[PDB]
CSV table of C-alpha atoms and ligand atoms in Angstrom, one decimal:
chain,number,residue,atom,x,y,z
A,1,UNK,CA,108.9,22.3,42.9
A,2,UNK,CA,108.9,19.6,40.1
A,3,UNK,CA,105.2,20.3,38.9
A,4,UNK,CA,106.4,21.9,35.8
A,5,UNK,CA,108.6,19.5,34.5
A,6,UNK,CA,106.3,16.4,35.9
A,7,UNK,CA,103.3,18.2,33.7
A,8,UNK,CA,105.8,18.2,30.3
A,9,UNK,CA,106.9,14.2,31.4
A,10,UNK,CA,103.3,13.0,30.7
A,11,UNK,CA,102.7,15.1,27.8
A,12,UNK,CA,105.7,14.2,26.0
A,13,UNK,CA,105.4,10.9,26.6
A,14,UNK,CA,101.9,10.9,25.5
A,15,UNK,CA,103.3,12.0,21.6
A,16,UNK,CA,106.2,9.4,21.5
A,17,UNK,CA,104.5,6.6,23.2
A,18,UNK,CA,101.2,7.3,21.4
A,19,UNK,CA,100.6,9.6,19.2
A,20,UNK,CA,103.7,8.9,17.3
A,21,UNK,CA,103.3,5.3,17.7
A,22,UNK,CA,99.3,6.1,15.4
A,23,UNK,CA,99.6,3.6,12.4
A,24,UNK,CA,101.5,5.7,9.2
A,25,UNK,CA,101.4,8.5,11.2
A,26,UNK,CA,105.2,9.7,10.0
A,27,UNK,CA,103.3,12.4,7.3
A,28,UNK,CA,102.8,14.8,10.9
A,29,UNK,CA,106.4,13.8,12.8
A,30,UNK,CA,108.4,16.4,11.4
A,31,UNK,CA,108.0,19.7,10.2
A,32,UNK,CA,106.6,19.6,5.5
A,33,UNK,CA,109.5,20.5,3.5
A,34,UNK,CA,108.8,22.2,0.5
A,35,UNK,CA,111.5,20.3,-1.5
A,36,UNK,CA,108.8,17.3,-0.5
A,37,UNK,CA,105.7,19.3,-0.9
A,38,UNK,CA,105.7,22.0,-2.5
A,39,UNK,CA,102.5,23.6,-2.2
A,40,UNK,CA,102.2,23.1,1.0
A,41,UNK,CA,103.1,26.6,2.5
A,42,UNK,CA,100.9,28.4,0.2
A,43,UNK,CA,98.0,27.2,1.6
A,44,UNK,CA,98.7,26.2,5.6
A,45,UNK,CA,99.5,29.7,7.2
A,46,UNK,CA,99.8,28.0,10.7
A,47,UNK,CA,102.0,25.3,10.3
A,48,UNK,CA,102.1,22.6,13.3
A,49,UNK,CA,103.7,18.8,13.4
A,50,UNK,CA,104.5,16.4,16.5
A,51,UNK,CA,108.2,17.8,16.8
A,52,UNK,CA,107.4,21.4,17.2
A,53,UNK,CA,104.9,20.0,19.5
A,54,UNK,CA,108.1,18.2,21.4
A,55,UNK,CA,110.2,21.3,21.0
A,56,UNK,CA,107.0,23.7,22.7
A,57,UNK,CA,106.6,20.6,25.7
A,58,UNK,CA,110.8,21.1,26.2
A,59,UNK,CA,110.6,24.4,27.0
A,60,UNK,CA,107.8,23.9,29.3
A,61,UNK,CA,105.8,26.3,26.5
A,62,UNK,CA,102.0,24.6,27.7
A,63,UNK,CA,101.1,25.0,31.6
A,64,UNK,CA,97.5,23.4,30.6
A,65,UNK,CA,95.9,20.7,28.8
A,66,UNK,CA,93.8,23.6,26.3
A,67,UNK,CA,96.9,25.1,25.4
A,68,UNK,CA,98.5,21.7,24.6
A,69,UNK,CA,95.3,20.5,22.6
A,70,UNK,CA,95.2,23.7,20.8
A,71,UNK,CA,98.4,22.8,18.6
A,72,UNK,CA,97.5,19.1,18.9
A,73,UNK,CA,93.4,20.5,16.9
A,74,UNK,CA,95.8,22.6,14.6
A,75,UNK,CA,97.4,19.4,13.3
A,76,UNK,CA,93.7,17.9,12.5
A,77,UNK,CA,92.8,21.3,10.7
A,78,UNK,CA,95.1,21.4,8.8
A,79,UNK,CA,94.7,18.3,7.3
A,80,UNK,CA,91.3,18.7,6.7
A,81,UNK,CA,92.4,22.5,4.6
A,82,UNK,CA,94.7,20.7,2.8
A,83,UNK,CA,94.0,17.5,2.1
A,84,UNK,CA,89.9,17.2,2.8
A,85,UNK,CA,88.0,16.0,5.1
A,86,UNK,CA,87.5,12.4,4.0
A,87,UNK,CA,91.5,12.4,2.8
A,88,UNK,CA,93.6,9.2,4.1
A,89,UNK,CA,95.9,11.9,5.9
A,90,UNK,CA,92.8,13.2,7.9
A,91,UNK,CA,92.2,9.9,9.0
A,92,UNK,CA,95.4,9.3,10.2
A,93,UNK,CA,95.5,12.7,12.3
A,94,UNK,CA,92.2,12.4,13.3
A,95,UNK,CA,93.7,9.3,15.3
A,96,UNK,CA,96.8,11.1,16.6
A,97,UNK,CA,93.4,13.1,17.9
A,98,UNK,CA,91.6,10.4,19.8
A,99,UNK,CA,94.7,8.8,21.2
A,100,UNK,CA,95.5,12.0,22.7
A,101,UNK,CA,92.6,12.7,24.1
A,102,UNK,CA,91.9,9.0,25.4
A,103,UNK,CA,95.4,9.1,26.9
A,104,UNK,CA,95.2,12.4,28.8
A,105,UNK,CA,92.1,11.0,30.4
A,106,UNK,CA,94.6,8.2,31.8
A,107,UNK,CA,95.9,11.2,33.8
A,108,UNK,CA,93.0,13.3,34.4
A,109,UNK,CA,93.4,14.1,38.3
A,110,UNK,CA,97.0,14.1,38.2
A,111,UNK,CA,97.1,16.7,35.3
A,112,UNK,CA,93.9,18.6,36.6
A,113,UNK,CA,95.9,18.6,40.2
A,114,UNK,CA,99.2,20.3,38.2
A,115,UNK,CA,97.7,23.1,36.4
A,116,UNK,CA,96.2,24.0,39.3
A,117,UNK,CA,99.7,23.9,41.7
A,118,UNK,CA,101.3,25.5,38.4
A,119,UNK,CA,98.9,28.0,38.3
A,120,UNK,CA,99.3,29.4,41.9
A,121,UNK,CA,102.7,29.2,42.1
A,122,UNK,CA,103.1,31.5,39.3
A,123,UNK,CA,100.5,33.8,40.8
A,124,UNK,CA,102.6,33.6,43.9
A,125,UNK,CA,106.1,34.6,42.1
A,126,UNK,CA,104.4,37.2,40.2
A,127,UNK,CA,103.4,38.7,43.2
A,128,UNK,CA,107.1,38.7,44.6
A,129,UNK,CA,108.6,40.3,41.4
A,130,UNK,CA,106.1,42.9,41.6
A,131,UNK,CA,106.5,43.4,45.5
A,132,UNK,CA,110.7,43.4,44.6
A,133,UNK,CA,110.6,45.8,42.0
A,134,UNK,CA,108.2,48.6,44.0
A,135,UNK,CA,110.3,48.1,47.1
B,201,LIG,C1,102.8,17.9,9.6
B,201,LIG,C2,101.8,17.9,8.8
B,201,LIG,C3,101.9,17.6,7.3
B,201,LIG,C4,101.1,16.3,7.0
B,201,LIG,N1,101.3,16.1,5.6
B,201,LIG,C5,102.5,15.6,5.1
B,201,LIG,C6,102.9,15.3,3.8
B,201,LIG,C7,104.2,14.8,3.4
B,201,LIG,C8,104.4,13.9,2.4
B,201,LIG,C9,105.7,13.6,2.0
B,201,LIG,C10,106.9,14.1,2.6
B,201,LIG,C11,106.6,15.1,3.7
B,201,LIG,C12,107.8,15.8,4.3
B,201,LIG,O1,107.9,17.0,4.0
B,201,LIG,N2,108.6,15.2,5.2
B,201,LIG,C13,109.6,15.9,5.9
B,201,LIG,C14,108.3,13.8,5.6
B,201,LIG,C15,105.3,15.4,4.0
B,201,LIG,C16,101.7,15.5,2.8
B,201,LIG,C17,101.7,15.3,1.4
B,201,LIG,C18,100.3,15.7,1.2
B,201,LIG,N3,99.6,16.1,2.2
B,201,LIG,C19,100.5,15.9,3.3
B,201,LIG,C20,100.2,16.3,4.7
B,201,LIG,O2,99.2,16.8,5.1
């Protein structure tokens, strides 16, 4: 019954405990304002940061690891659009990267186990609301 909200647990803990916690990584906490930056919107069309990330893991928006990491690569690429790839900035969220990854792997059965029990029991409730509504 808990898999859900044990699977958003580890993952937010992983970005306050760790990826948060990356040397001078406060440039990707929070959303660019364009008081701050003001060029930034013009050229990063899909804008991502570590507290969206924490807003999507509240609502229980990622029921896998890829879906998680997708947002998590977005961060990465678009530091390397707008700053380069050799940028300071890039550095720094190519660390947020590899402390992600190397922390997941801390939890690799148990998170491998959860998508898997998350998986069928939405299967199985799908199946219910369909047998509900034809009956
Ligand atoms: C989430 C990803 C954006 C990462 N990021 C951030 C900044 C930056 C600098 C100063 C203030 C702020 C700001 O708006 N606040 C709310 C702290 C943001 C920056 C300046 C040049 N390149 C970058 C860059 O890539």
């Amino acid at each position: 019954d808990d898999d859900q909200v044990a699977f958003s647990f580890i993952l937010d803990n992983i970005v306050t405990q760790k990826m948060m916690a990356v040397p001078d990584s406060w440039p990707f906490h929070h959303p660019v304002n364009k008081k701050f930056v003001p060029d930034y919107y013009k050229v990063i069309v899909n804008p991502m940061d570590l507290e969206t990330i924490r807003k999507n893991i509240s609502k229980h928006k990622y029921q896998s690891r890829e879906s998680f990491l997708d947002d998590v690569n977005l961060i990465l690429a678009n530091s390397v659009k707008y700053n380069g790839p050799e940028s300071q900035y890039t550095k720094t969220a190519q660390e947020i990267v590899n402390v992600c990854y190397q922390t997941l792997t801390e939890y690799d059965e148990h998170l491998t186990q959860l998508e898997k029990d998350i998986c069928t029991a939405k299967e199985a409730a799908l199946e219910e609301a369909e047998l509900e509504s034809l009956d």
